[PDB]
Amino acid sequence: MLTLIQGKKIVNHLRSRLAFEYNGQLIKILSKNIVAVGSLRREEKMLNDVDLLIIVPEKKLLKHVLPNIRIKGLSFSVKVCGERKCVLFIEWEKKTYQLDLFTALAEEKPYAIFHFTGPVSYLIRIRAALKKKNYKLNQYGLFKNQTLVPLKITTEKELIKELGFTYRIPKKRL
Amino acid sequence: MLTLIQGKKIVNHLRSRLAFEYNGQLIKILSKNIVAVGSLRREEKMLNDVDLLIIVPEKKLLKHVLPNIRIKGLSFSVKVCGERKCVLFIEWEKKTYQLDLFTALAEEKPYAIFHFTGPVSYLIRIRAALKKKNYKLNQYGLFKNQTLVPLKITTEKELIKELGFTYRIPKKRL
DNA sequence: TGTAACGCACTGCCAGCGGCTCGAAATCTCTCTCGT
């Protein structure tokens, strides 16, 4: 486990040294499209692991980003990897911790941000009330009978207000 | 062979005890989506066999319903079976009779109902005049030059009226 | 009229390139532990 600041100290070092491989074109990942999430964003004092989200602008990239990711200047290993989820072990300063990496689409940004902020308990209560209203909520979008519900929102905050719930900052979510 | 009422007495026993298997999930068949046809619906005195139509709501289900059909509390056999037609011999009251089972989609309902009601002669005479007008009639739909002709109808009666023919109740059809 | 389930010859067709067979290669679905 790592302290909150231990996780904080790591995040800033990464935003510059990011790239994924694709037809020889190693393409850097921009810090704007990067959002920190998980217990980290919840500002919990002690971190069980580290959780990061990625804003992917184009749909086809999915099958090439996470599978062919690259890391500058860090010893690491690969356990499991798909197009949406990727979990890697790392060697930061002689200790080993677990890291979680997820990708999301430009229209899923507020739906995704909200989901991965957590925690689980907070999310269940919302999905419970929506399941009691014939709705299905996930990190991608909102459904009714598997039919998308488009809302005139952009940020995670707008979504929660449009969902009709009391907005709460990460650490207030529980 | 069975009397008219003999088949009817059976039909009510079946509408409750019907199911088809699908990925271990045994799915019951609802009595609303069940319609009786053939010599039975025609109210003919003596029945050579029993004929039932089924309203399947979804297209993918076709290759799973009739092939994997199940009956509660009855020993039965299978003669021939596909996704559209299924013929079974049965043991009702120690005697052996033949049974016919057909499937149709929720949108094929009025076109299907008309077809399987019969009788043969009545159907041929109608379809003959339609063949003289570049039309093709079947249990599925209506065509002109192999292009489906959609009509603003729902029930078989509406279809017959839109076809422009004298409506006849089953026993009156001949 | 207008059609379905079937079994057969005839391919074509790839796991196989010669066979019409068994079960391969690859494209599936099911569950299971995971992830917030």
Q: What is the DSSP string of chain B?
A: -EEHHHHHHHHHHHHHSEEE-STT--EEPPSTTEEEEHHHHTT-SEESSEEEEEEE--STTHHHHTTTEEETT--B--SEE-SSEEEEEEEETTEEEEEEEEEEETTTHHHHHHHHH--HHHHHHHHHHHHTTTEEE-SS-EEETTEE---S--SHHHHHHHHT-----GGG--
- Tell me if residue A54 falls in helix, strand or coil: strand
Distance, CA of B107 to C1' of C9, in Å: 38
Q: How far is residue A55's CA from residue A44's CA, in Å, rounded to a whole number?
A: 24
Q: C-alpha angle with apex B58: B53 to B64, nearest 5 degrees?
A: 70
- Work out if B85's Cβ lies within 7 angstroms of strand C: yes
Single out the residue in B81, B105, B129 at which a domain terminates.
B105
Q: Which domain holds residue A158?
A: 106-174
- Check whether A40 is labelled as a binding-site residue: no
A115 and A96 in a common domain: no
Tokens for B9?
Answer: 């007495």
Q: How far is residue B118's CA from residue B42's CA, in Å, rounded to a whole number?
A: 8
- Work out if A117's Cβ lies within 7 angstroms of strand C: yes
User: Strand C nucleotides below 7 A of a protein CB?
Assistant: 1-6, 29-31, 35-36
Q: Are A114 and A104 in contact (CB under 8 A)?
A: no
- Check whether B49 is labelled as a binding-site residue: yes
Chain B residues 18-37 within 7 Å (CB) of strand C: 23-24
Q: How far is residue B131's CA from residue B148's CA, in Å, rounded to a whole number?
A: 15
Residue found by looking up tokens 């919990």 in the block: A44
Which CATH number characterizes residue A44's domain? 3.30.460.10
Single out the residue in A67, A89, A105 at which a domain terminates.
A105
- Work out if B121's Cβ lies within 7 angstroms of strand C: no
Q: How far is residue A131's CA from residue A144's CA, in Å, rounded to a whole number?
A: 9
Which CATH number characterizes residue A116's domain? 3.30.210.10
Q: Give which of B142, B167, B156, B159 is closest to B37, Cα–Cα.
A: B156
Q: Are A78 and A33 in contact (CB under 8 A)?
A: no
Burial of A132 (0-12, 13-18, 19+ CB in 10 A): exposed
- Work out if B134's Cβ lies within 7 angstroms of strand C: no
- Residue with minimal CA–C1' distance to C4 is B85
Count structural domains, chain B.
2
β-strand partners of B147: B144
